[PDB]
Design an enzyme around this catalytic site. Structure first.
Site, short mmCIF file in Angstrom:
data_model
loop_
_atom_site.label_atom_id
_atom_site.label_comp_id
_atom_site.label_asym_id
_atom_site.label_seq_id
_atom_site.Cartn_x
_atom_site.Cartn_y
_atom_site.Cartn_z
N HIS A 68 -33.47 26.47 131.60
CA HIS A 68 -33.00 27.25 130.46
C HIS A 68 -31.95 26.46 129.69
CE1 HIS A 68 -31.85 30.11 127.71
NE2 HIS A 68 -31.13 30.92 128.45
N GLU B 178 -58.37 54.78 116.78
CA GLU B 178 -58.45 55.00 118.22
C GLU B 178 -59.00 56.42 118.56
OE1 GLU B 178 -55.54 53.79 116.61
OE2 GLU B 178 -56.43 51.74 116.81
N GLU C 8 -44.87 50.71 120.34
CA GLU C 8 -45.78 49.91 121.12
C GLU C 8 -45.12 48.89 122.04
OE1 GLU C 8 -45.93 50.60 117.81
OE2 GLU C 8 -47.89 51.63 117.57
N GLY D 200 -37.68 36.12 128.86
CA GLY D 200 -36.34 36.31 128.32
C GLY D 200 -36.29 37.30 127.18
N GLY E 274 -53.64 56.09 117.05
CA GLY E 274 -53.85 56.11 115.62
C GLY E 274 -55.27 56.48 115.30
N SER E 275 -55.59 56.48 114.01
CA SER E 275 -56.90 57.01 113.62
C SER E 275 -58.05 56.15 114.07
CB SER E 275 -56.96 57.26 112.12
OG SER E 275 -56.62 56.09 111.42
N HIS F 79 -52.78 50.78 118.08
CA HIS F 79 -53.34 51.06 116.78
C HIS F 79 -53.37 49.80 115.88
CE1 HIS F 79 -54.63 52.95 113.23
NE2 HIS F 79 -53.47 52.84 112.61
C1 LIG Z 1 -46.99 51.33 114.33
C2 LIG Z 1 -47.90 52.52 114.23
N1 LIG Z 1 -48.38 53.10 115.36
C3 LIG Z 1 -49.21 54.17 115.27
C4 LIG Z 1 -49.63 54.62 114.05
C5 LIG Z 1 -50.63 55.73 113.97
N2 LIG Z 1 -50.26 56.94 113.32
C6 LIG Z 1 -49.45 58.01 113.86
C7 LIG Z 1 -48.78 57.79 115.15
C8 LIG Z 1 -49.45 59.17 112.98
C9 LIG Z 1 -48.64 60.36 113.27
C10 LIG Z 1 -47.25 60.27 112.62
O1 LIG Z 1 -46.53 61.43 112.90
P1 LIG Z 1 -45.29 61.83 111.99
O2 LIG Z 1 -44.58 62.89 112.75
O3 LIG Z 1 -44.47 60.68 111.62
O4 LIG Z 1 -45.91 62.43 110.65
P2 LIG Z 1 -47.00 63.61 110.42
O5 LIG Z 1 -46.66 64.72 111.36
O6 LIG Z 1 -46.78 63.96 108.95
O7 LIG Z 1 -48.35 63.02 110.69
S1 LIG Z 1 -50.42 58.93 111.63
C11 LIG Z 1 -50.88 57.36 112.07
O8 LIG Z 1 -51.58 56.54 111.44
C12 LIG Z 1 -49.17 53.95 112.92
N3 LIG Z 1 -49.59 54.25 111.65
N4 LIG Z 1 -48.29 52.92 113.01
C1 LIG Z 2 -35.97 40.36 121.95
C2 LIG Z 2 -34.70 39.58 122.12
N1 LIG Z 2 -33.87 39.40 121.06
C3 LIG Z 2 -32.73 38.69 121.22
C4 LIG Z 2 -32.43 38.10 122.41
C5 LIG Z 2 -31.21 37.23 122.53
N2 LIG Z 2 -30.20 37.60 123.46
C6 LIG Z 2 -29.18 38.62 123.28
C7 LIG Z 2 -29.28 39.50 122.10
C8 LIG Z 2 -28.20 38.58 124.35
C9 LIG Z 2 -27.11 39.56 124.44
C10 LIG Z 2 -27.52 40.78 125.29
O1 LIG Z 2 -26.43 41.66 125.37
P1 LIG Z 2 -26.39 42.74 126.53
O2 LIG Z 2 -25.33 43.70 126.11
O3 LIG Z 2 -27.68 43.34 126.80
O4 LIG Z 2 -25.94 41.95 127.83
P2 LIG Z 2 -24.67 40.97 128.10
O5 LIG Z 2 -23.48 41.61 127.46
O6 LIG Z 2 -24.61 40.94 129.62
O7 LIG Z 2 -25.00 39.64 127.49
S1 LIG Z 2 -28.53 37.34 125.45
C11 LIG Z 2 -29.91 36.80 124.63
O8 LIG Z 2 -30.72 35.91 124.97
C12 LIG Z 2 -33.34 38.25 123.45
N3 LIG Z 2 -33.20 37.63 124.66
N4 LIG Z 2 -34.46 39.01 123.31
#
Ligand SMILES: Cc1ncc(Cn2c(C)c(CCOP(=O)(O)OP(=O)(O)O)sc2=O)c(N)n1
Ligand SMILES: Cc1ncc(Cn2c(C)c(CCOP(=O)(O)OP(=O)(O)O)sc2=O)c(N)n1
Ligand SMILES: Cc1ncc(Cn2c(C)c(CCOP(=O)(O)OP(=O)(O)O)sc2=O)c(N)n1
Ligand SMILES: [Ca+2]
Ligand SMILES: [Ca+2]
Ligand SMILES: [Ca+2]
Ligand SMILES: [Ca+2]
Ligand SMILES: [Ca+2]
Ligand SMILES: [Ca+2]
Ligand code: NA
Ligand code: NA
EC number: 4.1.1.7
Lengths: 525, 525, 525
Positions: free
Chosen positions: A280, A27, A46, A400, A24-25, A69
């Protein structure tokens, strides 16, 4: 010298040569004039950046450097940091801040109260009070991430700092060596050794810090000398032991009562490189049964403090495992007998049982494959069915938190270019960090992604069964075409609706020159 | 009654009927027996959950309720919370915690030091000290999110709490009404009114809290009475004024010097519902030129405190705008003249200029369309080229954090089922929360997603030009097939490589009965 | 201009002219060239510095400015800040930091992670990212302390910042006016007024923010119009109403059941300027009885959110009390009858009953005396026996933290030089901030300190009786000679072992030209 030049010199002198980032900017003043000897690995979100870096750090056994960023980018990575905290991953997370002249007004992209943002998931979090402090702050970050117990750290840097003049005295930072490679004093170590030598029926439990230390072979020698069964501590983030060695007994169940029952009759239980314990499920009962005492060796004071039972020693796992393995007596007890082969589950010409998938992977993958698990309803079967002979062969999200395995598998594959990485990921889990696929395509990092597709959050449907919980919403995830997602991000895609197709798809994938995604139709629970 | 029953009663009595979530095991005791009168909206990753809820809250002008899984789920949402903080979005974020009996041992899925995790991006963050406290804590969360200045709040609940007995005295929580609908006292309000009446050349600047308050029409009357030009404060998260009204002057540039130059010669500048100011670029100079004084009306003490200039009044924007609009004199000055139409940029039969895209959208979309912007290199053109007559017609990530617009557009469309939502999102930005597409498909929420595909992070390539910064890595994002991603998640997909195809794709999309993604090939910068 | 010159100009332009401090080396660059128009008030320990400033701010109804030494000095003041938080005291706490060039190495006197130190007891806490930001940060501190709900704030300043050049644009900070003098919108205010007019048996409860707003007289008119009894909310930090007015009913008991029983039969209870409620003892039961509804007017969103019952309005207490008092109808109900005189308790020629002490104080003190209470076993008697006709006549540690009254009484006396201040402090409580006596002597601030000496922590011996708790250590404090302590710090000292001696000592004290301490031998509980 500028702060920019001094900081990149510090990084290279400390062994860092790769930046995992989403720019980002704030950076751009850091990233401009990017040094020719450094790599930049772009990911599209990220959580993916940090997951890739985490797999890279864990497999390489060295710190990984990240650039994000401001607050939003840091925030997007916060689930990834929860896993990194639990795996003791040495991650140096840097984030760009607004120029010092507009921090006060809270211009767009100001990271407000920045050091508090990633807390409580980092060992150290900081924003320097001046530009010339930045190299010293970076030095602190490097060492804080790298000292035992390793873990993620956070540094916020105002973008105007990089072009300022550095302090000439910053050169003293470049070659600092910091060691935490320590072991218990001789007198107390001799007491421990004699307790192990005197045990009538010892058991060993190993956790992820064994694999992080590459202490695996020393633990094999220790187990062979003591003639002791070896289990992996519950909720295992890594594999610390050869899974077909005769002493191996598998993954412990993650329950209080289950573990004390398993350890019943063992007089001394030596835990190395694990929390005591990462339970767990709810499974109340005794922490240990009468007749069992526990001794924990941990690299982490927080683990030693919170254990509900046992003695503890806070020390480096590599140094302690080596010392113990070389000091204990060879017991005259018989070596434990290897666990029996897993049975073949009946499989028709339709959707795949997970057991079939793991057996086929074990049949076809190279002996030095590396697996990642984010298919938690199938974890027990995975641990039974994959012969993992070598260190660094298994990773599972340590807190997890899903969204780890897909990007981490790319970082592991980057760290270990000669070891085929195979990530086994549920259809639900695959979505969290789906955009990481693009990084594998762009850099041609040849990870294989096996998507276990049964259309549901199967582990939750199962737990709802356990609770007798009716009318739970949100448990089904129909209608995702993983081949199309792979095509979206430039990764070759295959489908396996039956065993014949699974074998054929794995044959192609294993021969391929780039990353491959295989969508496997698995049985519904 | 149980804590579960009492809490759902509190929620329904306080107007909450929808849970935006991604479930986990710590949440199953909350989600079981889910009430028949509530909706659950599943999204596949927590940045998506929170973005959907945020768009829903902002468009509905009421709190939205979220349920996430412990630390990792909360962490995955932290970038989304950075935007919600800056938009004053009333979000009630709940996360499930481990059972109280294993919090101490830090079992898997324990959210350690939970209340500190989302800080500093929440107004209030809490974990109750007992099960019977949960309804009261939920009441606090509801009101903290909803009182001015609105914003996100966080509540962590151990999963064993839900089945416990509630305090019978919790019924007093159900019908509490809490008001912050306040305005400046009469004496001081009369002083303000007379200052506005006496101004020789007033200007008005409006921010997002005007649109949040639905104060737009009152601000139109105020501007007409004062005969004053109206600008939108920089880095605008919302559109607070009809963009073709004669007083409208557009989006302010996000720079110190640029703004003072723009305001030069205006003796009194009245800012309503904005920070003073959300600058972005470095553009040093005078905050105001001699002869200009500034008066800010803000709902947020933090905004009033940090303004570098001007007087301020901390009060409700709806109440203040209504009072001012009805109290000021009708000035005998001439009404400002409307801005001229934008020019048509030359367009050949190849890749689309963004100006062409916005002109075509304006030509074809309904007059009550709602737009979202996450195409920041094209923001100026967007603001010039879309006639947005009505309130609630524009959303842009308030903290600059990408991954907002795609999910938020789904939440807005859910909030406003009769207003066609059209999200205009860059190819880079589209990836951050790509999995949100699945929720639009599953619930058949008919948002239109227009992907501006030029293969690069164009705003960053531009800023690198400004810095004269050479050798910046990570600025290009080739090789993404957005039609395949849409197919992956079950959304109809179209491509537009030229103007003829753009018109045809928009015609189909506008007629469609479900969500549609259009990948537009736009010119490279 | 320098940062030093610009900051003192900002302070004077914002009405600040006094620094309450205990100096150290990080503060010397701020304090040098101290302006001729400012006062410095030294105290010997930082709890004393902050207590003095707090009494000064509360009595003056304006912010007070404090300067402390780094982390240790801030830390010594943290108990004082707990009271200031609960009293909404507008305190600007500044602390000196190490020079920016040694913050990194953590030189002696570095305040590490400084902004987190006073959390969670401050509204805003900050360290600027550059010297030129310091005036703007100071501006933010001033306004954050001063906006409703008022409270303490914290600013850490590296000592090298003061001599640096200021930003010329900082002049825009000097004359900023920020108002939170707001009241409920007309439509909703009319609804409230009609509910009050329609009540059959209204009651009024007042808290400390009434006295802080000087809303006391408006609340008298409101109570007279409504013909309503008036109570003071429990754990009262201030006195919001004339204690001999016919509507006055005294201090509420600090218990849930006790309060609902007291309010039984009152159909509408209007609470103004208090939390709902600052209970203390365990006294479970109904929050309100059937037939009573509650409406709270509070300046503090945190109070409105956490009330377990009732509606709430978040607005300025001065503006709301004035509006209500002038809008309600004159009820035709009879005015409440004044409470009867307190009885005289039998008193022999030995140790003094507290009732005797308060009766004698009421007999002898001027009608415009100001009292402070840190004798909590005697609070009920104090509230019954002192006729306090005027605003600003009573202070009690708002968080229950002792060490407030002795220094606060000095600050109040400094704020109100023509009103005799009389602090009534237990022998236990007197020790916490005993060194504050020196400031009264040095600056000849003529506070009277009445030490109620019974040799024990009487309220705790009483509570141990309630618990039937045997064998509690640490409840007795024999062997303190308060006359010698007063002599130690240069304050005239008197003793009163009986009533004759109490009368004679008060006569001398009231005639004296400096501070006086009277040690009273009171009955043991
Ligand atoms: C979560 C996140 N990560 C990174 C950025 C940094 N970022 C990024 C990655 C830009 C480029 C976006 O590209 P785009 O294709 O969506 O649009 P443009 O081509 O019009 O810039 S502009 C900017 O501030 C951000 N704003 N938010
Ligand atoms: C970031 C995040 N969000 C939600 C969960 C909760 N979660 C979820 C959403 C499960 C289901 C995963 O489904 P899967 O298709 O990846 O695998 P299984 O069908 O083998 O459970 S098990 C579990 O703890 C998690 N662990 N992490
Ligand atoms: C800073 C601090 N420490 C300890 C206490 C605890 N405390 C103490 C120590 C009490 C006894 C005070 O004794 P006293 O002599 O001042 O008054 P009484 O004899 O009237 O109780 S009552 C009470 O809450 C406190 N409130 N504040
Ligand atoms: Ca086999
Ligand atoms: Ca599944
Ligand atoms: Ca047109
Ligand atoms: Ca782009
Ligand atoms: Ca009398
Ligand atoms: Ca006492
Ligand atoms: Na945090
Ligand atoms: Na603190």
């Amino acid at each position: 010298a500028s702060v920019h030049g001094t900081t990149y010199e510090l990084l290279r002198r400390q062994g860092i040569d790769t930046v995992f980032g989403n720019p980002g900017s704030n950076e751009l003043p850091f990233l401009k004039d990017f040094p020719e000897d450094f790599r930049y690995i772009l990911a599209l979100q990220e959580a993916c950046v940090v997951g890739i870096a985490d797999g890279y750090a864990q497999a390489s056994r060295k710190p990984a450097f990240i650039n994000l960023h401001s607050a939003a980018g840091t925030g997007n990575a916060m689930g990834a940091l929860s896993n990194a905290w639990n795996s003791h991953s040495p991650l140096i997370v840097t984030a760009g801040q607004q120029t010092r002249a507009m921090i006060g007004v809270e211009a767009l992209l100001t990271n407000v109260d920045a050091a508090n943002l990633p807390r409580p998931l980092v060992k150290w979090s900081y924003e320097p009070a001046s530009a010339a402090e930045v190299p010293h702050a970076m030095s602190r970050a490097i060492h804080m991430a790298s000292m035992a117990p390793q873990g993620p750290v956070y540094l916020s840097v105002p973008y105007d700092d990089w072009d300022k003049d550095a302090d000439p005295q910053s050169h003293h930072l470049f070659d600092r060596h910091v060691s935490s490679s320590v072991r218990l004093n001789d007198q107390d170590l001799d007491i421990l050794v004699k307790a192990l030598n005197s045990a009538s029926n010892p058991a060993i439990v190993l956790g992820p810090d064994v694999d992080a230390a590459n202490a695996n072979a020393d633990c094999v020698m220790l187990a062979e000398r003591l003639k002791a069964p070896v289990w992996v501590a519950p909720s295992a983030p890594r594999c610390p032991f050869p899974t077909r060695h005769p002493c191996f007994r598998g993954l412990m169940p993650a329950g209080i009562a289950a573990i004390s029952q398993l350890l019943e009759g063992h007089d001394v239980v030596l835990v190395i490189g694990a929390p005591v314990f990462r339970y767990h499920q709810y499974d109340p009962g005794q922490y240990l049964k009468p007749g069992t005492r526990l001794i924990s060796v941990t690299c982490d004071p927080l683990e030693a403090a919170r254990a509900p039972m046992g003695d503890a020693i806070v020390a480096d796992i590599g140094a302690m495992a080596s010392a113990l393995a070389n000091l204990v007596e060879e017991s005259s007890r018989q070596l434990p007998t290897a666990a029996p082969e897993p049975a073949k589950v009946d499989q028709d010409a339709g959707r795949l049982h997970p057991e079939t998938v793991f057996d086929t992977l074990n049949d076809m993958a190279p002996e030095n494959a590396i697996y990642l698990n984010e298919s938690t309803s199938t974890t027990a079967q995975m641990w039974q069915r994959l012969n993992m002979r070598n260190p660094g062969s298994y990773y599972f999200c340590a807190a997890g938190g899903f969204g780890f395995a897909l990007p981490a598998a790319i970082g592991v594959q980057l760290a270990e270019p000669e070891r085929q990485v195979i990530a086994v990921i549920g259809d639900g889990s695959a979505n969290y960090s789906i955009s990481a696929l693009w990084t594998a395509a762009q850099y041609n990092i040849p990870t294989i992604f096996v998507i276990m597709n049964n259309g549901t959050y199967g582990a939750l449907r199962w737990f709802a069964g356990v609770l007798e919980a009716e009318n739970v919403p949100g448990l089904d995830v129909p209608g995702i075409d993983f081949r199309a997602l792979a095509k979206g991000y430039g990764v070759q895609a295959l489908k396996a609706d039956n065993l014949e197709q699974l074998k054929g798809s794995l044959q192609e994938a294993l021969s391929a020159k780039g990353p491959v995604l295989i969508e496997v139709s698995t049985v519904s629970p």
